[PDB]
Amino acid sequence: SEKLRGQISGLKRASLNAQDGISLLQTAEGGLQNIQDMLQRMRELAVQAG
Amino acid sequence: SEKLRGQISGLKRASLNAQDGISLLQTAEGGLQNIQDMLQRMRELAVQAG
């Protein structure tokens, strides 16, 4: 019984830590998408001049 | 008759002594249960950090 109860508590904790991890990657993805947006405008502006 | 009465008195004394002994073990068991209860919250808060 004690072994099972301890395992269950650990499983809750890891389960919460999963989403705790995922949020950071989502934020980084958003920032990189903004940078990607700017780069293509700079490229088109580059090909215009010439 | 003397031997039998002496033995009967001894039997009554032992009968009381048994329960007198059992109470102490019950108390110790309760205390150990409380300690075991605390240690599991310690384990859960341990897996929290990390």
What report would you give on this structure?
The structure is cut from a larger assembly and holds two copies of chain A (50 residues). By secondary structure, chain A is mainly α. The longest helix of chain A is centred in the middle third of the chain and has 47 residues. Chain A is rod-shaped, with a radius of gyration of 23 Å. Chain A starts with a helix and ends with a helix. It is classed as protein fibril. Keywords: Flagellum, Flagellar filament, filament, protein fibril.
What key phrases describe this protein's structure?
part of a larger assembly; 2 chains; mainly alpha; Flagellin (chains A, B)
- Given helix and strand content, the structural type of chain A is mainly alpha
Number of β-strand runs of chain A: 0
Radius of gyration of chain A: 23 Å
Largest interface: A-B, 7 and 6 residues
Taking the alpha carbons of the first and last residues of chain A, their distance comes to: 76 Å
Family (chains A, B): Belongs to the bacterial flagellin family.
Organism (chains A, B): Geovibrio thiophilus
Function (chains A, B): Flagellin is the subunit protein which polymerizes to form the filaments of bacterial flagella.
Subcellular location (chains A, B): Secreted; Bacterial flagellum
Report a brief summary of the structure.
This is part of a larger assembly, with two copies of chain A (50 residues). Chain A is mostly helical and 50 residues long. Chain A has one helix spanning 2-48.
